[PDB]
Amino acid sequence: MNIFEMLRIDEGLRLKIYKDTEGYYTIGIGHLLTKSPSLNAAKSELDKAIGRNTNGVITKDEAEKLFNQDVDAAVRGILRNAKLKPVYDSLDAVRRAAGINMVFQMGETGVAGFTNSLRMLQQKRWDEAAVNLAKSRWYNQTPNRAKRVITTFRTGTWDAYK
Ligand SMILES: [Cl-]
Ligand SMILES: [Cl-]
């Protein structure tokens, strides 16, 4: 297990444009295209991302490519965030993955609502963190996924994903 497989599991793989749990146009391995309600807008963003006239459909390779880039950017976002980076550096490898997962899912944004959890994580108060993290819209909206991530942070193992 690693971040890529983990996320592949949590996000799935779809080769045609679809709506995510929030209703946003997405493709591939959770690659958000746009929050706009316009399918055309989405198609435009897709073509721009891929470099060709896709007509809303992509290949597996293409999907994987967006994915790699997306992971990369998430990490890079983390390393560039002053609130995040210190936490991340303090963690072990498994838990780092849990944290990348979350940013991939929701972005850097929202980091403020997660202040308390951060602090807990930085201190290595796993069970307390786990509880605090569950007090969130995130958990209430995507509970199964959130449980997996929270478990990961709590245990430092991949058991939730096995
Ligand atoms: Cl892109
Ligand atoms: Cl879920």
Question: What residue ranges do the domains of the chain occupy?
Answer: 1-162
Report the SS3 class of residue 124: coil
Report the SS3 class of residue 34: strand
| Ion ligand 1 — residues with CB < 5 Å | 49
Which ligand gives the minimal distance to the CA of 65?
1
* Distance from Cα 133 to the centre of ligand 1, integer Å: 30
Residue of 134, 111, 125 lying closest to 154 (CA atoms): 125
Residue of 88, 101, 100, 94 lying closest to 159 (CA atoms): 94
* Distance from Cα 20 to the centre of ligand 1, integer Å: 17
Cα of 13 vs its chain's centroid, Å: 14
Report the SS3 class of residue 59: coil
Return the exposure string of 56-87: e unless at least 16 CB atoms fall within 10 Å of the residue's CB, then b: bebeeebbbbbbeebbeebbebbeeeeebeeb
DSSP secondary structure, 13-26, as one string: -EEEEEE-TTS-EE
In this structure, is the dihedral angle defined by the CA atoms of residues 92, 78, 102 and 12, taken in order, positive or negative? Answer: negative
Strand partners, 38: none
Tell me, which fold does domain 1-162 have in CATH?
A: Lysozyme (1.10.530)
**6, containing H or E segment:** helix 3-11
* Distance from Cα 119 to the centre of ligand 1, integer Å: 32
CA gyration radius, the chain: 16
Gap between the Cα atoms of 128 and 106, Å rounded: 22
Q: What is the resolution of this structure in A?
A: 1.8
Distances (CA, A) of 101 to 50, 57, 104, 113: 23, 25, 5, 17
* Residues in the annotated binding site for substrate: 32, 104, 117, 132
What tokens were used for 28?
């591939």
Which ligand gives the minimal distance to the CA of 148?
2
Asked if residue 34 lies in contact with residue 45, where contact means CB atoms within 8 angstroms, the answer is yes
Q: Is 127 a catalytic residue?
A: no
